[PDB]
C-alpha cells in the first residue's frame, strides 16, 4: 500500500553504528582489486571521483565544525560521509581498471583506503560523540578524524591527475 517506515527507537543502534562496517568492508574490497569492464576513459573516472571526493570533503568539513554547536548533526553527516564514500569505494574499481598503468589505479585504490580509515574513525566517533556529546575527548578525537580525513581527500584528488586523461 502506502508501506510506512516506523522507524522507532531505532534499526539496530540509534547512534551511527551498522554502517561502519560498511566503511570497513569499503577498504577490504578495494583491497581486493579492480572491478572491470570501463564505460568510459580513465579521465571519466576520474572526473567523478574528484566530484565525490570534494562531496565528502565539505561533509568532513562540516562534521568538525557541527561537533562544537550540534552534536547530533554528527549522525546524519557521518551517513553522508559514509554514503559518499560507499559511492566513491564503488567507483574507485572502474577508475583503477581504466588506468593503463599498475602504479596509477594502485595509487587511486590506496587513497581511497586513506580515506577508508579515516572515514571510518570519524563515523565511530561520531556515533560514541552522540552517545555523550558533553565528553570533550571523544569530540577532540572526533576533530581529529575529521582532519585526517580531510586531509587524505588531498591526496586522493592528486592521486587522479597521474592517469590518462
Known amino acids: 500500500g502506502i508501506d510506512p517506515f516506523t522507524n ?5 543502534a540509534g547512534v551511527v ?9 569499503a577498504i577490504n574490497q578495494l583491497d581486493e582489486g ?11 573516472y576520474q572526473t567523478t ?9 565539505v561533509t568532513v568539513q562540516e562534521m ?7 552534536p547530533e548533526e554528527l549522525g ?9 564514500y560507499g559511492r566513491l569505494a564503488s567507483q574507485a574499481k572502474p577508475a583503477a581498471v581504466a588506468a593503463e598503468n599498475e602504479e ?18 570519524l563515523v565511530t566517533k561520531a556515533g560514541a560523540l ?17 582532519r585526517r580525513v580531510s586531509e587524505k581527500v588531498s591526496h586522493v584528488l592528486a592521486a587522479l591527475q597521474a592517469g590518462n586523461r
Open 34 to 44: 579492480p572491478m572491470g569492464d570501463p564505460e568510459g576513459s580513465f579521465v571519466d
Open 76 to 84: 546524519p553527516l557521518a551517513n553522508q560521509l559514509t554514503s559518499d
Open 49 to 57: 571521483m574528484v566530484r565525490t571526493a570534494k562531496a565528502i570533503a
Open 130 to 146: 552522540q552517545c555523550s556529546p558533553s565528553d570533550v575527548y571523544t569530540k577532540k578525537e572526533l576533530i581529529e578524524c575529521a
Open 17 to 25: 553504528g551498522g554502517m561502519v562496517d560498511s566503511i570497513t568492508q
Open 104 to 121: 596509477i589505479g594502485a595509487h587511486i585504490k590506496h587513497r581511497v583506503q586513506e580515506l577508508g580509515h579515516g572515514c571510518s574513525a
Open 64 to 70: 568538525v565544525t557541527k561537533s562544537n554547536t550540534s
Open 8 to 12: 522507532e527507537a531505532a534499526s539496530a
